[PDB]
Amino acid sequence: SIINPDWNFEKMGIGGLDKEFSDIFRRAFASRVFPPEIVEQMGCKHVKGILLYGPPGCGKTLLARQIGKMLNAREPKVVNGPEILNKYVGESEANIRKLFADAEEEQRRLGANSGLHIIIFDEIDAICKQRGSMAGSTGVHDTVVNQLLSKIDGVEQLNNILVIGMTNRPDLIDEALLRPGRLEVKMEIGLPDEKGRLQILHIHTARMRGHQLLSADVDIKELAVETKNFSGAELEGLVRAAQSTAMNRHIKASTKVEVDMEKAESLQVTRGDFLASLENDIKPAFGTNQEDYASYIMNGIIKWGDPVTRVLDDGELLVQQTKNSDRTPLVSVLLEGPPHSGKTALAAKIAEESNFPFIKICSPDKMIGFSETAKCQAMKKIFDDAYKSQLSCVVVDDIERLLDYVPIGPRFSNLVLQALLVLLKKAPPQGRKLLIIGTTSRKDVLQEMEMLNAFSTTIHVPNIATGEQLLEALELLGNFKDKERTTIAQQVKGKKVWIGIKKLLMLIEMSLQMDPEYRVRKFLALLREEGASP
């Protein structure tokens, strides 16, 4: 026998993955546990590989090494994908050839009695005549993946190998590498849920518990419910950062204060270090990024009147609809209005008030000088990342700039438009939700390009349209010392005021650059000059 029928995978390594082990062992490797006599009598061949895909750094290689060890196999021969590639002619294939040598010789001298060799790959998608389909010129020869296939299953047969491959993008894997007789069993390693984030944390902090270095203050259930969508590597980094910060705190404190030796030896880390590191040190990749909001909502949100509440309530209703309904797992919306009316800030607030696990903002500020194909790739990557969580919220910052629209011509890029139009109507995998919020300042152009037929709703962000609203906004913004405000109220009673909030901030700040005498007249003149009406 090679293992007891029920196997075992816990406390020695792998954390939150326990169903995965049973599934893989019941599906594929059932031919190496049955009694050998019946296996020989039946006359069946064993599987010759498996494939594992999923997020990056979620615990794939550990499972590979464990499965290799538990079969009573020789030491694994790891190798990395992009490393076997050379500019010389006919040298990217000698590298592939130079990995099956020992197995070949051992099968040569000893036939049908050898052991097993595991040849774990990594980033197996680098060598594939399929990445060239996507826009660009990268043919990767297409001879490399004809020298690997011809060795696994060719005119000469090997019966003492087991190839395990891992990849991050399952959609660029060549089709000729998944037929029966070759890599022929797929499997997914998803993100860890609550129980996994508990087990991994328990595993990674046993040593410090053994010597009682950890204080009794810290719990683990609290830290297993705050970390949402963390991957295991992130948890390990969190523990390490907590250790380091506690160490630095203790050294600094005991150095500054000549404490007695009792606490000097004691190196308790407490819980404050944990929360400090969690909130200041580690930044997840598949979770909320609480830092960039401060770069968009720069001056809070002021309630100058009625419309703000209406907009926020509509956003709440759409969020609620997408959260708790079936038969409709994809929802869209579009915010539009006159320029400088504050459309981005409201979108950011609506997204933030949802409390979703995964929030992302795709704006053109980070695509300066990009060619259009790069923009398409970036958008596709963001959406792909968003597809890997139970709930999500993706914002598109400015749709008129993504297309490079210019009134002369008109001119724009077709590729981005078509990619967006296709992506707005693609449902996620079964059982997962999504929500998309747009933004723009030219509704008519999008209406003309047949783009307003893909969105599902629309919201209007009105502008300051009366003197009373301007007066209330100024009062809440707290300027002009309430005495010049009486003259301002007298002057702005006309009610023919059409100005944006951001422009209002700019005008107030500009007018505040003179002495108390001419400030009011300067501000009134500036407002009157820019007083264009619909």
Add this chain to the structure above:
Amino acid sequence: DRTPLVSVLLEGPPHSGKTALAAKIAEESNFPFIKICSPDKMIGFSETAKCQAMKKIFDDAYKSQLSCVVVDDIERLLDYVPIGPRFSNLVLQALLVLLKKAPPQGR
């Protein structure tokens, strides 16, 4: 016997439920080869990639004694946009040529 190739086009207003009816008609035929070629899985491809993909999906249907292929959202395959107009000539030509090519004898 004197007509080994047929075609049909479903048309109507938007949001009318055309793809569902096409799929339901296809699934109710009991043909041994049944494929679908939609633009939902070609995001970011250039024109030549689309041509090669369509040609590949069509080539297989000539290796089976029966088949039924479906082409979905012809408008999005050609990259149409009312401004201009603009579109991909090469894909249109490939489609116009593939719509009138009978399979090898018998099929």
